Amino acid sequence: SSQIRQNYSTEVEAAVNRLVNLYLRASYTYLSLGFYFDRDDVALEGVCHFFFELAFEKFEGAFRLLKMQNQRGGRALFQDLQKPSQDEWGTTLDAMKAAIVLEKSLNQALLDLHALGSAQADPHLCDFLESHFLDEEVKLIKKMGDHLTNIQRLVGSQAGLGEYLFERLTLKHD
Amino acid sequence: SSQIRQNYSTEVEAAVNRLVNLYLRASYTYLSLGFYFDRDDVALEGVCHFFFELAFEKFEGAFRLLKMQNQRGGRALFQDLQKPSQDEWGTTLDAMKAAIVLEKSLNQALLDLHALGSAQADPHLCDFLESHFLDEEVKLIKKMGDHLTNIQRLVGSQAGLGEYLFERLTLKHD
Amino acid sequence: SSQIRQNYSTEVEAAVNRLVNLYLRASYTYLSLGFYFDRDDVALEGVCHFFFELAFEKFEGAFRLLKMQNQRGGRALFQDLQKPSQDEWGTTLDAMKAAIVLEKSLNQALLDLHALGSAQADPHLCDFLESHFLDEEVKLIKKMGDHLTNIQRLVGSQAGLGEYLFERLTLKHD
Amino acid sequence: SSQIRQNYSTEVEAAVNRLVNLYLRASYTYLSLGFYFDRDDVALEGVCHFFFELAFEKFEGAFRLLKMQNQRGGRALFQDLQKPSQDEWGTTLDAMKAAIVLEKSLNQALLDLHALGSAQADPHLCDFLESHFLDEEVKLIKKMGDHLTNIQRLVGSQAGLGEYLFERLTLKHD
Amino acid sequence: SSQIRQNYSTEVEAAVNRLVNLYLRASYTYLSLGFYFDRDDVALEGVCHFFFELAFEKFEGAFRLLKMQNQRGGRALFQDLQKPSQDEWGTTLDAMKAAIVLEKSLNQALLDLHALGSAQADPHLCDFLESHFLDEEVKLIKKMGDHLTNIQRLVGSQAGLGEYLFERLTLKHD
Amino acid sequence: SSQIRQNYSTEVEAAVNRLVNLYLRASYTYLSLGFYFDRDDVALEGVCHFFFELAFEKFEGAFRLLKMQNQRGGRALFQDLQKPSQDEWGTTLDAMKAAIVLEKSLNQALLDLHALGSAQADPHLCDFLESHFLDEEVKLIKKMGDHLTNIQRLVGSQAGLGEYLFERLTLKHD
Lengths: 174, 174, 174, 174, 174, 174
Ligand SMILES: [Cl-]
Ligand SMILES: [Cl-]
Ligand SMILES: [Cl-]
Ligand SMILES: [Cl-]
Ligand SMILES: [Cl-]
Ligand SMILES: [Cl-]
Hints:
Main location (chains A, B, C, D, E, F): cytoplasm
Largest sheet of chain A: none
Shape of chain A: elongated
Order of helices and strands of chain A: HHHHH
Protein name (chains A, B, C, D, E, F): Ferritin light chain
Oligomer: part of a larger assembly
Family (chains A, B, C, D, E, F): Belongs to the ferritin family.
Subcellular location (chains A, B, C, D, E, F): Cytoplasmic vesicle, Autophagosome; Cytoplasm; Autolysosome
GO cellular component, one term (chains A, B, C, D, E, F): cytoplasm
Bound molecules: chloride ion
């Protein structure tokens, strides 16, 4: 079959294709989050830009997985992409809670693939995830946790005021 | 009569002169809004500057219509300009609600003139409006809608605080 | 009432609002003059540009009066703006004669307001007019008088030739 | 037949080829006008340069139509090009009157093609004409009308003097 | 309901959401085409880069439609995204034939939406498509047709040689 | 009659007008060749650009002849321009064979005019042709002969391959 494939299990090849679908799903979810915060009746520019940056970051992760699939001699297989879980995303707090749930699901999928690679004695796969995915995910989840705490402290008795101030003074706008 | 006029109906010529009056009326309304927010007992610099920019934008639209009237060989005719609807404009929220009502009236006048041009098979007129007016109006109304939503979220129990913060952190001052 | 108003009579406040209307009327008159000289059957670019510059200058005078009204703690009040006295403005000579009549009417209104300020012992008002209006008006009327004399000397037996040459060789075009 | 053609009627394809012939005819007419004003017994450099620029502008319009024909998958077909209507073009006034007649004939051909495209529900064709032809034609006809008025005012009793002055002081020489 | 929506039908709003799904489907198809040509057993870098550029171009079209949806006050609604029609894309000729079929399907969807906008007297929608989509699509389909002709002429008796040469000497690499 | 004409025969004047028609015919032929190679079903960019450059070169020759006609005091007379000999131009080899036939016809017309000028003892005419036409024509015909030989050597058993390679590796594109 493949002229280059070496030490690359069918189990890892399949799991990489599944992980691509999870990252593209996440990218699509962040595209929906971004456009919700762009609505004229939501209108939180910094929140919109935060989620569009994450849509691009998740697409880049999918792209890197697909490049690696070909580098190892596996076959990229694309499946249908389910639409995001919601059409409307509530407050910035609701959205950032949904985002951290989504990132922890990606992080668990990364850890599960690392464990499969470990079991299959596939050190290139394990290094690839460690070098391009695990720390990026830990750093993003820490950032989201920091944002959740600041959003929560700003709710008070004046939720609209707090949501405005967080978008203006923490998030980047423009 | 005219050495240059071609495919330019008397109906469109008249409607263009009426639209100039509507844009000059709008410009005058925004000059009044700007000077109200400059009062020492109102004193919202970013709101003042927002409305002065719109006074200049509406004057530029009138100027472009008048230039086009002459380019087509119609006769610019000026009528009396009514004063604005109010002498005092209330809160930033009141003013931005009046502004969006005014812009939707200009937008409907643009759409009505486009429909007349369509009926008269006047593609230069229809292109002129599409290229210099329709999208500028859609973008401005979207901006005003974004501002209305942010102003509304800041009212809370503390209207003065919200009105200050919106002027400081969204509007341009510096 | 006003937290800042000091030595600012109701008579001056009202007269300033009237003077704003006169300057905006003058600006509108110069916008009409400019577009008449832009017609394809008139086509005197330097004359068109001369009058558009004066439309902007008169608007700036209105703007400065309105800023001063607020600086003194008076209330800017806008009234309807009458359309210009003519729809068609004849020759460059006819137009420049109408312009000098209009400027002498503005100059008399300035002198009348200065005399009211003098009577009311309002030195800020009298200084404001002296510093931003009286000499600008004297200089403009002198310029118009210079232009009238040159236009008149060029009529001769060959009015079209003279009107072309004045526009080409005295007025600014591109 | 064509691998790219989509929504492109045979009626529009044929009309585009006819319009190319009209623009090339116009270009040839302006080449003849330019060389007439270059004669040592006519010798009006600014008039010569005005018409050579229009010869190049009309050729560019033909070129853009031909490029569009291929972009849509139609077949460019060239026909014989008739010589211009005159061998000698009289005065600058005669020439500019012939030019405005020629431009209004091109403008009507543009409007007729736009109406055909409209009837055929061909929005690419209608946009192409609006974006590259209709406003360029309106602006050129306005310019020619401005020039006709200035040429006419300079005839007076001294036609040679006026024709010299217009060439020297309005037209570009280098 | 919407504070900004004006002249924006539910029919157009729905059709825009469907068109977004078609553009995202097309983007996903081009991502699959790109990674197929990146395989070590296909290895045509210029073909890979051609299709990745188109994946980004189709995503940008989806993004612009979604921005416009919000500008008009409609609600962006995302649906499931079907996977591409093939897992393996054959030769460069097979792939470029599939690409032109896909682009003509997008072009027909654009023309159908333009016709709906026309019927609904929605000139902003019709201008938006003309200005950002119709000519981009005509130009891309012309490019693909040019490439199909060059690929076809290179097949000869030596298909591998021709496929190499086209990738090396026409497409951008590295 | 002419104030400048000296040593300029009616025979040369007429022959110059005929030669202008031949150069404009040649320019039109090259415009048709260029647009044929721009077709999506021909698609040879370097061949398209080669022939468009020659269309411009032939127009420049016509322009120089017309300038010279006026410099000598002859009268430029334009005649109808026949359409090119073909609507479709076959292969690059067919087109380059037609081009060399066309250039040798122009070269013979140049040599015939030089011989007339010689017979009429018109050294300015003979120098003009030698300095701006004869060597340009010899150099172009040599270039076309070089191209014909390279095109012919590339036909082999694989005409499509050869036609691609010649366009890619000899002609200017991208
Ligand atoms: Cl789902
Ligand atoms: Cl009123
Ligand atoms: Cl009145
Ligand atoms: Cl004829
Ligand atoms: Cl499917
Ligand atoms: Cl023929």
